[PDB]
């Protein structure tokens, strides 16, 4: 019934947690805007 690790998942220690963005995650974020 259990695994352990969620609610904390998807948040990188060396990044989100330190409020730091990796070199290319913006590429992904700009993709959520209509490109025409």
């Amino acid at each position: 019934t259990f695994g352990s690790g969620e609610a904390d998942c998807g948040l990188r220690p060396l990044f989100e947690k330190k409020s730091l963005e990796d070199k290319t995650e913006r590429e992904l974020l700009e993709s959520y805007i209509d490109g025409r």
Partner: protein, 259 residues
């Protein structure tokens, strides 16, 4: 990964390496979803057509790695397999439909700056992020080129590779291959008219296809590297196992036994 770049440290903490004990070789990639559950492609463990059939005792799981071949001191963690669960309706005979498998670590793994779990898509996140044009990200230690035929350059990287790929609309996906596609898979890559390149490759299977929610800032694993024809070939797209569609079977085994 073809036409990708070297990953930054701890950039893909959930990255898992499926290691074969004997001979010692990297088979596939995989992802961490909890302190004791790993998710990879089914054909990485079972593929009758190529008499491939790996049992728990034949593998090891290296977690929190960057370099493809250097043992990394107090960075990576090596875990053994307690149990393998391949989707009971995995179609190896034709198109690798439902190319998925869960692995249960023998003992829980502690997280670190290098080891962390990725989130699985929910009802709204899947519906929100899985749109053509939206970019995902694939990571892996797989080949850097089609290695089965003479080609210039090295075969596999020395460091984990990363590449960002646009999600392709089914119609385009379907007519780019003679292989039969199902709702349980999706394709991604740049189109002939987009200029940029990039795609997964052999050895990359199991690797995760992740996207970051613009809402909560968390990374979700939308797919699993499954197959493709060649690597980064014009008019051709990589195909990934649709994780969300198979959510009910994952939930069912993950939560099946007490603890």
């Amino acid at each position: 990964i073809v036409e990708g770049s070297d990953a930054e440290i701890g950039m893909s903490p959930w990255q898992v390496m499926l290691f074969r004990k004997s001979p010692q070789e990297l088979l596939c990639g995989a992802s961490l979803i909890s302190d004791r559950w790993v998710l990879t492609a089914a054909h990485c463990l079972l593929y009758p057509p190529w008499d491939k059939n790996f049992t728990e005792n034949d593998l090891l799981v290296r977690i929190g790695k960057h370099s493809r071949t250097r043992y990394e001191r107090n960075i990576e963690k090596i875990s053994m397999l307690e149990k393998i669960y391949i989707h009971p309706r995995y179609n190896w005979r034709e198109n690798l439909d439902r190319d998925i498998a869960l692995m249960k670590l023998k003992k829980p793994v502690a997280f670190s700056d290098y080891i962390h779990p990725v989130c699985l898509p929910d009802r709204e996140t899947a519906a929100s992020l899985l749109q053509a044009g939206y970019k995902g990200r694939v990571t892996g230690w797989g080949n850097l080129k089609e290695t089965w035929t003479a080609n210039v350059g090295k075969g596999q990287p020395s460091v984990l590779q990363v590449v960002n790929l646009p999600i392709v609309e089914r119609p385009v996906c379907k007519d780019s291959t003679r292989i039969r596609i199902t709702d349980n898979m999706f394709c991604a890559g740049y189109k002939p008219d987009e200029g940029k390149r990039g795609d997964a490759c052999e050895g990359d299977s199991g690797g995760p296809f992740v996207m970051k929610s613009p809402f909560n800032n968390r990374w979700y694993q939308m797919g699993i590297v499954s197959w493709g024809e060649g690597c980064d070939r014009d008019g051709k797209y990589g195909f990934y196992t649709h994780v969300f569609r198979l959510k009910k079977w994952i939930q069912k085994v993950i939560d099946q036994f007490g603890e």
